[PDB]
From a paper:
Also, the structure of the full hEC1–5 ectodomain bound to 19A11 Fab was determined in the present study. All Fab-bound E-cadherins crystallized into strand-swapped dimer structures. As the K14-D138 E-cadherin dimer salt bridge is necessary for X-dimer formation, and the affinity of 19A11 to E-cadherin at ∼6.5 nM is on the order of 104 times stronger than the affinity of any dimer of WT E-cadherin (∼100 uM), it is unlikely that the X-dimer would supersede 19A11 binding. However, 19A11 in complex with the full E-cadherin ectodomain, hEC1–5/19A11, forms a twisted conformation when viewed from the top, resembling an “S”—henceforth, referred to as the S-dimer. The diameter of this S conformation is ∼360 Å, compared to the linear strand-swap diameter of 370 Å, revealing a slightly compacted structure. The fact that this conformation was seen in solution with two different activating antibodies in addition to the 19A11Fab-EC1–5 crystal structure lends credence to it being biologically relevant and not a crystal packing artifact. Examination of the molecular details of the dimer interaction in the S conformation indicate that there is a difference in the angle between EC1 domains at the strand-swap interface compared to other hE-cadherin crystal structures. The only significant conformational change in EC1 between the linear strand-swap and S-dimer is a symmetric inward shift of the first four N-terminal residues (DWVI) of both monomers, with the shift most notable in the Trp2 residue. 19A11 Fab forms its own salt bridge with K14, a residue vital to formation of the putative X-dimer intermediate.
E-cadherin is a cell–cell adhesion protein (1–5) that forms adherens junctions between epithelial cells. E-cadherin is a Type I classical cadherin, with five extracellular cadherin (EC) repeat domains with calcium binding sites between each, followed by a linker region, a single-pass alpha helical transmembrane domain, and a cytoplasmic tail complexed with ⍺-, β-, and p120-catenin linking the cadherin to the cytoskeleton. The stable final form of the trans interaction is thought to be mediated by the “strand-swap” dimer, named because it is mediated by the N-terminal beta strand in EC1 participating in a domain swap with the similar strand in the opposing cadherin EC1 (22, 32–35). The initial encounter complex during adhesive bond formation is thought to be via an intermediate in the monomer to strand-swap dimer transition, known as the X-dimer.
Numbering used by the authors:
A (entry chain H): 1 to 132, 136 to 222
B (entry chain I): 1 to 132, 137 to 220
C (entry chain C): 1 to 540
D (entry chain D): 1 to 309, 313 to 362, 365 to 391, 396 to 416, 420 to 430, 434 to 437
E (entry chain L), F (entry chain M): 1 to 220
The structure:
Amino acid sequence: QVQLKESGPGLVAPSQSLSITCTVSGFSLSRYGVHWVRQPPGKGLEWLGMMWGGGNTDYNSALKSRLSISKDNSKSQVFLKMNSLQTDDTAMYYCASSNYVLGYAMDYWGQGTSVTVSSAKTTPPSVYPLAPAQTNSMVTLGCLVKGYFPEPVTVTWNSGSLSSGVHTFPAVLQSDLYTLSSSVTVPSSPRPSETVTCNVAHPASSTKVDKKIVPRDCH
Amino acid sequence: QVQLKESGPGLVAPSQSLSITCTVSGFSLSRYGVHWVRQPPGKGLEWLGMMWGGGNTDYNSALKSRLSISKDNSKSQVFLKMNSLQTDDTAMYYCASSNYVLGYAMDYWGQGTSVTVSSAKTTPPSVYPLAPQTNSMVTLGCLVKGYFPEPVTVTWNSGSLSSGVHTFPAVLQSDLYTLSSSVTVPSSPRPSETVTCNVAHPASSTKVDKKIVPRD
Amino acid sequence: DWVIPPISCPENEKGPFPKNLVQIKSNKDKEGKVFYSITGQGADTPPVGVFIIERETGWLKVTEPLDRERIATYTLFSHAVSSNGNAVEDPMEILITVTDQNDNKPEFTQEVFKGSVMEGALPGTSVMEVTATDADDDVNTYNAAIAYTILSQDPELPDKNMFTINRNTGVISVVTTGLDRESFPTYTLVVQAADLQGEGLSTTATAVITVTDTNDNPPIFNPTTYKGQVPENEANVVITTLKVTDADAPNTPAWEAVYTILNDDGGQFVVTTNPVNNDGILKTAKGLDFEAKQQYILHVAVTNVVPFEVSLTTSTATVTVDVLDVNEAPIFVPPEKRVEVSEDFGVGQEITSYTAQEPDTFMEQKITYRIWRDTANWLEINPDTGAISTRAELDREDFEHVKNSTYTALIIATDNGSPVATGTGTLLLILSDVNDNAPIPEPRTIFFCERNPKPQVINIIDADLPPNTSPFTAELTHGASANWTIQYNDPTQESIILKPKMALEVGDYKINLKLMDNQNKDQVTTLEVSVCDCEGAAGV
Amino acid sequence: DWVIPPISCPENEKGPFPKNLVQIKSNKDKEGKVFYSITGQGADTPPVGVFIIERETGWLKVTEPLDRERIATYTLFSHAVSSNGNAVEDPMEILITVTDQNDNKPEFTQEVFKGSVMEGALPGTSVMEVTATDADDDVNTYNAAIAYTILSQDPELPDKNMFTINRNTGVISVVTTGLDRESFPTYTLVVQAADLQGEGLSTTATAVITVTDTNDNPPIFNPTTYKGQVPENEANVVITTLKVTDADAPNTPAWEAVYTILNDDGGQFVVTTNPVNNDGILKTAKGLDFEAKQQYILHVAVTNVVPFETTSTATVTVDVLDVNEAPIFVPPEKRVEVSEDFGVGQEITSYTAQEPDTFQKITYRIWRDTANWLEINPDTGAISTRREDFEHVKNSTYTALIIATDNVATGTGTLLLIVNDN
Amino acid sequence: DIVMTQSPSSLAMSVGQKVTMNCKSSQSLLNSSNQKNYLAWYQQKPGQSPKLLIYFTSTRGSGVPDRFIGSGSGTDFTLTISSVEAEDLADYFCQQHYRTPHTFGGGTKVEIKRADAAPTVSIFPPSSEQLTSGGASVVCFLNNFYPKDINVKWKIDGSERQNGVLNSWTDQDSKDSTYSMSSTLTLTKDEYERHNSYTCEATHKTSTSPIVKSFNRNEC
Amino acid sequence: DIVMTQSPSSLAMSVGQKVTMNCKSSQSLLNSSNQKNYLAWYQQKPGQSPKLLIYFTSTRGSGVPDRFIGSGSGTDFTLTISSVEAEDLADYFCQQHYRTPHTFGGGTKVEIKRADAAPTVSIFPPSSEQLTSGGASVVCFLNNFYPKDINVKWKIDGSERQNGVLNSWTDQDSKDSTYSMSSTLTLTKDEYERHNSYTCEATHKTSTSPIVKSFNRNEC
Ligand SMILES: *[C@@H]1O[C@H](CO)[C@@H](O)[C@H](O)[C@H]1NC(C)=O
Ligand SMILES: *[C@H]1O[C@H](CO)[C@@H](O)[C@H](O)[C@@H]1O
Ligand SMILES: *[C@H]1O[C@H](CO)[C@@H](O)[C@H](O)[C@@H]1O
Ligand SMILES: *[C@H]1O[C@H](CO)[C@@H](O)[C@H](O)[C@@H]1O
Ligand SMILES: [Ca+2]
Ligand SMILES: [Ca+2]
Ligand SMILES: [Ca+2]
Ligand SMILES: [Ca+2]
Ligand SMILES: [Ca+2]
Ligand SMILES: [Ca+2]
Ligand SMILES: [Ca+2]
Ligand SMILES: [Ca+2]
Ligand SMILES: [Ca+2]
Ligand SMILES: [Ca+2]
Ligand SMILES: [Ca+2]
Ligand SMILES: [Ca+2]
Ligand SMILES: [Ca+2]
Ligand SMILES: [Ca+2]
Ligand SMILES: [Ca+2]
Ligand SMILES: [Ca+2]
Ligand SMILES: [Ca+2]
Ligand SMILES: [Ca+2]
Ligand SMILES: [Ca+2]
Ligand SMILES: [Ca+2]
């Protein structure tokens, strides 16, 4: 029942501070040590610091002058704060729990929060349907998520019902706008109820849109 | 008075074994830790190992498989043994004392012994006089040529002549060493005031004295 | 008894956890297995879990870092039970002491400290105090031993270090003598507090020391000399304006000027300090006399409201006062001249000579006397000599011009000068009475009743003075004795009593009454006597 | 009573020295200053100085590394003493135990272990035993628990692992159906001793196993047929030589051959074994007779000095040579009694000699007669005449000599012929 | 800080092979209080948070199969996958949890080798919704191929177009170990309407002849 | 092993200046039992054995003047010569004596800067004893110069001779901070007898014109 959840701003301007909250449940903070780990895009893990149950704190030696870790036992929240963020600080930020039985190794991880360091403007995505005629072969459909910022967006098919045969491609950056696409391969003999709809969400711009894929194939 | 003196072979053939003895005095070997440090020509210091008083031994991680350190409290001697000798083992070998009051830092060092790993043969030196009217100070010297291995000791007038002496490091060519020494003495000397260089090559059991006479 | 020592554990340890602190043991383990547990705050009581014990070995372990500034000591109790669960020992008290580390910088109580000091302070004079604290262990280490030092001083012109600070208490005292507000009013020092007796963690603060003004700058006259010009008879006239400057703080008691005239024993002049300009307005308190002293060389000294700190030299000024000559009226000597002259004075004769004196010492003055008040036109005067001569006949009995027995006249004395002035004098002329008046009856009209008349008293009036009015002699002339009889009222003979002698008829009668004082006679024919138709007292 | 536990210190420590072990305290240290001291082997007596104490704090320190294989336990006594020197506590015993480390590799008692096994030994036959030792703590750890394994086996042709070793005792036993010495006589094995029950420090040794030779190969004649000739009356004459080949270990009783002639009732032949060639030298034991049997068909069975753990029987033909033989008189000493009355021309007897050769005409003649009074007929051997004489024959019987040459061997026969006429 | 040196940086094995990763520590990680080396291994599959794979050098975390073996002592540590499965593709990080600050290793990326596979190419014309906004994106999906090295050429009416193309690769699939690629050609609407035939050509190691998928604007 | 990193590798100061040497350790050297960092500094003057200069980071050894100051904590340590003297030229090594194997640093060579000094050149013909053995060596001493960089050119009858020349420099003098050089030209006797004029030319930064010393075989 041990659960950790990172929450914070997705976008942070250069030379501005970052503040993340790690909300926990299923254990008491006073008995466990909660860590902060970050991971730049395509790089390895970097240990940032940790907060022990008794209130003591340790930090990354290189980033100690820029870091600050506090917590609130009553609120079940651990806090990380970083100063004067630059491009190299664009990373995924994780918190993790640990306790003395395992030598304070991190055995429960949160799902992470994305922090982009850029002075660009938040832009909502435009979702476009990708429709192909195929004959007795599994047809590939898709929808295109173009022109958003910052990361990330979440893409599901038929509200999660469609999972097998889905390829969601990583976003490509160009001119401070991201573009990604997702493909789903469904059988080419659809029933009237057998409809394909991609669900795109961009929490940065509070965007949630559904696009039904209607193939244009004569009559 | 804590004293340490290294003794060993000066020259040993490659792939052979080396055994160096450290004879100590002024302290009890069972209460002190004796270290072995070596220094290759022109390089820094290299910790080889140590022998504690209780008899425990620790070694250099890179050389452990080729090293062996023992001792004899009764004879007041610490031993180093090195197997499968390489030419890069040619170095000056020191032993040093230490004790727990200084955290086993090395506060007394021996004079060091020279160990040359080479298949070349011992050759005695040839000592030649270097003789030259400005009515000032004249510079003389003697030339120690064609010996192997290191080292040789050079003094002037059996140690009486100290100031104004420049003894130059040996330079190896064709498996034979050559060094020179210069001494600057006042010109116009009295008949008793004569300049002689004393060259000693312990490896060849050679001791030669050369008086510097003016050229006719 | 051999006992367990305090178990020491350093704060801010970094792992690995758990770490052994100490192993305990019961010697009952020779009889059978023993199982160990611990109680107390930090073990089974908040903060729970910080300290644990391995049940079968007796190893006391710590599971996380400690913080001495949060919890500096832990008190645990160890327990030992057999395989049955019964206690085989009494609980053993264990003390965990968190060993301090220098992990707290000193901190000044204020970012900026304020201080004040006055000029010329001697060395060792307390100025201000700075304070700092340190959270580390002050009992068992020097990690909280703060030592204060001065880092910088702005400016350093009077001396590189004008102040000193004590390493222990943190007070700032003067250490050099040259302190002056006029040259350097404020000092900004940066102080530093460092633990480990000055060798450890540091922190900085600023002390702003301001210099208080003292009266150590005397007022200096801008021009040392002045020249004034004032007319003669005039008061509160501005002669000149004094100019001073004071290097001390303006609009303070050490800057306001207090002027004092040195050589003015008579008190003729007065100087008041103008508050707007701090200037000296020199006026004339009294009126000056050009003929008394024509020039004044006044020495005025300037000071301050408050006395002079230290000892300077009081500036003394010089002002030349030139009095201007104004023409003044000639003063008669004496102001009123009394001369006794007989009433029967000769018309051409001279009475006296009335001379005035010119106060203006500068000459060319021409005094010309002229008659001013002469209501009877009895007098004339010569313009050059001032001699008073008669013009008509003097009369002592003239009741209009000569009210008393004296006659008053006024003589002016017009001078020469740019402002022509006129001095006026008084002449008191006493007139000696001569017997030139003859007696007359006061009631010249008398009434008698025909039947049983009432005698009527007739007063006698003589305008002269005694002995020219003494007794009086009365006599009825032109007959009239046949019908009338007179007789003196009293032996002084100042008045007479008239009464009919015979029974007379009703009508008007005329009686000639002849009166004489001392050989001066006068018949007053107009003794109109009517005989009325009445009995007794006659009204008319 | 709460007491001080055993103080454990690991051997082979690296520093820093000195290192605290445990702190002691006298509760009298609030009444005044208490000074602490330690005695015992390792403190004030040899080995001096290994353990020290800080007199004012009470910290017990160790000043150098330890070796459990040299001194596994130390026993000290701690002392509490006031300013004047008087003891304020009873001496407290302190035990220092040296925690063991696996710093000693196992060592075999020797480099080469030798052993032997019989040929074709059944599985489970204990061949030999290797033994190794380990100086580490065998009481509290597995740092001295040795596990024996087999690494190599040379050769590995009959089976890759013909032998198996025991993990504990380290005995080497047969695990396959067996092997022959004629195929592979020597087996070299590489055994390994490792601590930590086999998962620790290792050490190898060589175990050579020789296969003991049995008699599982019978001697086989290289030529199964022979032929030879020998004269008639001749003994110990070489007839032929037998050739055998035995695959067993040479110069051993299982290789040495012993030839036994089967069909020789009379014992006329004997075969001796030449030890160098292992060949059978066939010589005639007794003298042969051509007229008795002209050809012998001998069967020789070859065996070994050691019994078998299919015997080859050869065939050798012996041809007897016809040799001439002298006529044997019947009897060799002819005795015929007679009196002196015999006529001068009468025939006394007829000594007929038999000719042994069945392949020849006998002619009789007189060889020696002292009296010269005996005549013989060459055709029929009839002895005819041609006791007082003492010089001719002193004995009572005259001895005669009769020869009989044939068509050439002479031979010899005797005639003895047995009154007071004078 | 304690330095964790991880080797190799990358490995590629076929399913069934043994994977070996090494991790070196700058100093000892042995806790004398419990005789355990504080070495941990973390597994990070693509798109997921790290998972505690090994701790205390050899102890497996919850839900970790037996093929993951942690070993080592002193300053040399090893993570072995006895027989690697297709799902095991991930980044593997070693970490000392001995003394703070805790420190990670460089990581070892584990990839899966498989037989070569040709891509299945699908082309998509711009949508009606995008053309109204003035843009026109032409997408080309290239799915289920191996190895990852692939090239896409766009043709517009027989002329190659290099500008306005963005490509993206997926991570290696956890089931079949294949890759997939997305190629997007972005033009303005006016530029898109000025041409007729659009083609993406896939050149892969599997075939010398490129895989061609095209559409014509004047068709359905 | 614990790694000791020493910087800089070499320094040159004039007498009276402050020398600062740094030594970085791979891990902490603090002994919790006595709160002392087991860091030592050794001084090795040329031709001598090493001398214990500092131990326990800041405690001076016997016979060490006050100008040698050891400082530092954690993993950063410093040896300071507050005001360097001419005799202080040596190699300085930092060493951890915390955990065996004890390990040294690379060393910092301290040299003394002084004013420039031209060399005094002396030339020497071969000896009679050497000519008897068949050899002929011509020696050229270059004494008491600074800086160490110097060049010697040998000429035989005006022609440059490069082969058979061995050069050697002394260590910097502990008193006057100068260097000295010995150059030896070795020929066969027959070659020596076939020529007349032998010259060594000394080129030093102090003079653009080289210092020339020569002798003639048929002279003297
Ligand atoms: C006196 O009075 C009588 C009567 O009035 C008159 O006739 C007479 O003249 C008077 N005598 C005088 C005035 O002398
Ligand atoms: C103390 O003083 C220092 C130096 O002026 C400042 O840098 C610091 O911020 C504090 O004000
Ligand atoms: C001017 O007058 C002052 C009087 O206050 C003197 O003190 C000064 O010396 C000068 O004479
Ligand atoms: C002199 O005084 C008289 C008054 O007595 C004035 O009236 C006259 O004008 C003059 O001033
Ligand atoms: Ca030389
Ligand atoms: Ca502090
Ligand atoms: Ca503290
Ligand atoms: Ca002043
Ligand atoms: Ca002032
Ligand atoms: Ca003033
Ligand atoms: Ca006047
Ligand atoms: Ca006048
Ligand atoms: Ca009169
Ligand atoms: Ca009169
Ligand atoms: Ca041992
Ligand atoms: Ca052991
Ligand atoms: Ca072992
Ligand atoms: Ca066999
Ligand atoms: Ca056999
Ligand atoms: Ca046989
Ligand atoms: Ca015959
Ligand atoms: Ca015959
Ligand atoms: Ca006879
Ligand atoms: Ca007879």
